Design a protein around this nucleic acid. Structure first.
Length: 400
RNA sequence: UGUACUAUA
């Protein structure tokens, strides 16, 4: 810190005015210092005369180099966001040029700022607060190659894409949907903890739920097509995504969401069916299997049940049949508990059995009877384990 | 008895 601003202790003075700082030419030094930053933080929140604003505009967002320097700074990025806020609230003759310049600084260094832990905050702030038409120019400056993937998988940068999805109209970011939907890109992005969050947010924004009822017909159609292209790519890699440590959450979301019912049935039919036994024994996919049992339409649910109950094991090395393998498996046991709870819920009225005016009560009673007979014959083995005890308990609880 | 994310003074 400049010596003039210090006292006898080598400590920042008291009674310091914002104008002193602005006039000194030493603003950059206060802005990257913890204590200076906090003085500025409070100073910039108060009443500001026109020249105080003018000096902030010039020194904080007026020159590219000092702009970039503050934006990438642990303390300075906050001052930048404040001054941007004040600039957008100040409708004098300089409003347009200030905003245009800001748009040019960020655009020219888009990738670098997005990837930076601190500058990515300036970007998010700018996307939210600039006039939409200029925020759209920032989106347009996003890279379209491997750098876009790196943004998506970065713990900080991914939040830039999320901000875009939240505050920018689909038309302007439609290229992101198709970028992501490219098979190799989807592969990389969904195999990553942060990338998955990006895909998830995109899916939600593209969903025709209560948050999108304000769209025009034409805009609904644009959203509908984008979703359909993304889901095609997602469902093409469905087994890989469902068994993946991160992307299983995305598959679960699609399966669990009634507003994505058509895509849920696609996933169940083309990916889960005929693979229930093996998927049930996987750490990650077992969770997708539970969601599928819970949310499948009754016609598919009956096929899933049949697949388990009539599951022929060519060479039984881990148990005589699918039910037997799953009940005593470390992950599969959860799938069976799920099947059981569903049946008990059906038979006891806690779940609808009548889908679309037609009543599958008799099928639930049949499945429950099979499970009851199996648990009865196996009670001695099952009672050795917590999962077995829970099933025995679920059944005992039903008798009442 | 079995998984993620929720990121700066």
């Amino acid at each position: 810190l400049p010596t003039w601003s210090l006292d006898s202790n080598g400590e920042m003075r008291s009674r310091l005015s914002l104008s002193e700082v602005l006039d000194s030419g030493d603003l950059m030094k206060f802005a990257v210092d913890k204590t200076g930053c906090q003085f500025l933080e409070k100073a910039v929140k108060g009443s500001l005369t026109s020249y105080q604003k003018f000096q902030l505009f010039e020194q904080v967002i007026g020159r590219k180099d000092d702009f970039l320097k503050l934006s990438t700074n642990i303390f300075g990025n906050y001052l930048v966001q404040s001054v941007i806020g004040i600039s957008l609230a100040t409708n004098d003759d300089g409003y347009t040029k200030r905003q245009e310049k800001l748009k040019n600084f960020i655009s020219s260094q888009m990738t670098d700022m997005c990837l930076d832990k601190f500058a990515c905050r300036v970007i998010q702030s700018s996307l939210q607060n600039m006039d939409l038409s200029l925020a759209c120019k920032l989106v347009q400056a996003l890279p379209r190659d491997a750098r876009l993937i790196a943004i998506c998988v970065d713990q900080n940068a991914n939040h830039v894409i999320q901000k875009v999805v939240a505050v920018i109209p689909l038309k302007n970011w439609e290229f992101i949907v198709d970028f992501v939907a490219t098979p190799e890109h989807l592969r990389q992005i969904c195999s990553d903890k942060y990338g998955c969050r990006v895909v998830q947010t995109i899916i939600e924004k593209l969903t025709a739920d209560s948050m999108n009822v304000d769209l025009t017909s034409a805009a609904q159609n644009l959203r509908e097509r984008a979703l359909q292209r993304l889901m095609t790519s997602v469902t093409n890699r469905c087994q890989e995504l469902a068994t993946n440590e991160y992307a299983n959450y995305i598959i679960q979301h699609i399966v669990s969401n009634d507003d994505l019912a058509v895509y849920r049935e696609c996933i169940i039919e083309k990916c889960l069916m005929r693979n229930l036994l093996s998927l049930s024994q996987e750490k990650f996919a077992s969770h997708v299997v539970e969601k599928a049992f819970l949310h499948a339409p009754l016609e598919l649910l009956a096929e899933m049940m049949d697949e388990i109950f009539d599951g022929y094991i060519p060479h039984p090395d881990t148990g005589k049949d699918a039910l037997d393998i799953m009940m005593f498996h470390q992950f599969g046991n959860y799938v069976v508990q799920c099947m059981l709870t569903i049946c008990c819920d059906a038979v006891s009225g806690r779940r609808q059995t009548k889908e679309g005016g037609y009543d599958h009560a008799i099928s639930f009673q049949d499945w429950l009877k099979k499970l009851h007979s199996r648990v009865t014959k196996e009670r001695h083995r099952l009672s050795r384990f917590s999962s077995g005890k829970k099933m025995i308990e679920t059944l005992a609880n039903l008798r009442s």
